[PDB]
Assembly symmetry: C3
Homo-oligomer: 245 residues x 3
């Protein structure tokens, strides 16, 4: 059966209205999203990762970077970048793009990661190159400089190209979890919500642990439920074990 | 390329079957859902609101009205309506409708909220007008009257029109969270699941708090992840903080 | 409004790539998933079930079976199949298939449940017949036999036919919840994620209980949000109360 038309409602019948045009950016984003939504069968996995010791390590490295006057503040998302990059090395089918006809998968041998950054004009997604080959200090410096560029609205078209995977960390603003949409032509996206201290069973008692909620949405034409579970688990375990750089 | 047709299966070869036609209302709603699903890219945010003090206030107020013979029962969802109405005031992009070509956004000044009400014929969505201009007692009287009209199956078409936003509260029947579908031409819907006592860290120890799980699905063509996080946080904090009316 | 086409990106400008043709099985699977995603408006419910006593009962029964030389190991998923089968008996609208034009619902009087099993070629879903009429021991035998057959790539066409409902349990690989896609022409699917010991309020304190997270995705044209909650609640209550077989 044919599709019903979009509702044609005279909203003025119910009170005052103001009809505004969207910005070109929002029109471009909306068009891309409408395409991706129908072409990409979405599955979303949820998980929680223990970052108690990572956070202690981050604070340690932040004082030791200040003593050396290195001018760098390590933020949690840099660790997530490296964990995602290491996971893309272990399961390379997540580092891929599916052709339009669904018949051919392009496996990428480079690892670039887009990171959503909030601006006075909304979230934009700069792409960072060779994340798997860069350290925490270097990536923190790039993120600071480019996020500044984003807030000042002078981001370059080139600086948003070449992504293999997107991270969208919104926990500084809220949510305990969320289910993002895949940023085509990538096949997966990681959402990050607000960490919370939770009682966690150690086998004999509950102890307080800083738990970070993460989510993974993915193109189900490429990734099945089992591999999605393997992938998010690798990111979980990697983040809960990282204590170098 | 072209979509695979719907599966054709002779179900009678596995056992007894009975083919029934969908009701008149289910056919219309099913046609709307098919349209809304493919043209609205959904993101769903999850959150949990501390309603410990609010529930104590509600019961106290229900006692006050009882021992003064006011014949009004304050249910939790009326507080949710007021918090949503305050959020729609503070973030008016959520109180809007997108045109069918996705080019222009109608910002509504009035605030009417549809509230899912369960009936022997399933969930229906009566619409309550001027929620931002009505108190808790008045809205509770309206809810009592309309829910009976709904449960008795007497709702007119007018009583279901003009919605700006929908609340679907199913926690009385179960779920710890869920991801509802947006009710076009609205751009967001709040889901409400079953509250539970949870241990909540206060900086030194876990204390029991009554936490209410809520969810927000929204039209990603209109709302990005950052604004969705701001919005569900406003609903969260506003709801938790109510001590009046 | 015309749909924007798939992005045309020269990925070789960012680094080395390898283009691989999908296998036939993977092509068909994607085609089936692409159709299901656009024609089924998905809602997903989440829940957690207390399996503390069920697990001690399964462990006790697996010990009795070995001590009685019954030579059968009982896995958690057979209990879930029977709980789903009982839910399908109690809410027969979930045991159904919607017609291609969305106008007519085929109610099924037989109860067959597909169970996702991992293979060298990914998850596949053999179908088990008359789950509501089979005991726990008998279903475990079929599960063991057919799971090995699936891993060997030896499933017959008949062993995949007749499904009424799918259970997809990925908790041995990770996730705390997930949102599966409905396996058309069925109307719902249950996802099962990793169990965890959690603090559960008993009225005056928190006690550790083994909580199993489950999720229910369903065709919203058939099932409304309230019936979805009733259904996941029945599975929850039945699974958390089983002490026989």
């Amino acid at each position: 059966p044919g599709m019903l038309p979009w509702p044609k409602v005279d909203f003025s019948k119910f009170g005052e209205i103001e009809e505004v045009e969207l910005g070109r950016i929002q029109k471009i984003s909306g068009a891309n999203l409408s395409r991706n939504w129908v072409m990409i069968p979405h599955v979303t996995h949820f998980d929680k990762t223990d970052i108690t010791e990572l956070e202690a390590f981050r604070k340690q490295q932040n004082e030791e970077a200040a003593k050396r006057k290195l001018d760098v503040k390590i933020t949690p998302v840099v660790f997530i970048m490296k964990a995602v990059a290491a996971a893309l090395e272990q399961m390379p089918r997540f580092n891929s793009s599916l052709s339009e006809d669904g018949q051919r998968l392009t496996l990428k041998k480079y690892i670039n990661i887009g990171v959503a950054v909030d601006t006075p004009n909304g979230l934009v997604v700069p792409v960072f190159k060779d994340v798997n080959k860069k350290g925490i200090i270097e990536l923190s410096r790039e993120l600071m400089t480019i996020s500044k560029k984003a807030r000042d609205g002078k981001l370059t078209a080139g600086e948003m190209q070449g992504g293999c995977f997107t991270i969208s960390s919104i926990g500084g603003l809220g949510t305990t979890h969320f289910a993002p949409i895949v940023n085509a032509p990538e096949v997966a996206i990681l959402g990050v919500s607000k960490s919370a201290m939770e009682p966690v069973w150690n086998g004999k008692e509950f102890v307080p642990r800083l738990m970070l909620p993460i989510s993974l949405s993915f193109d189900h034409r490429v990734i099945d439920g089992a591999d999605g579970a393997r992938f998010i688990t690798i990111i979980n375990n990697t983040l809960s074990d990282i204590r170098r750089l």
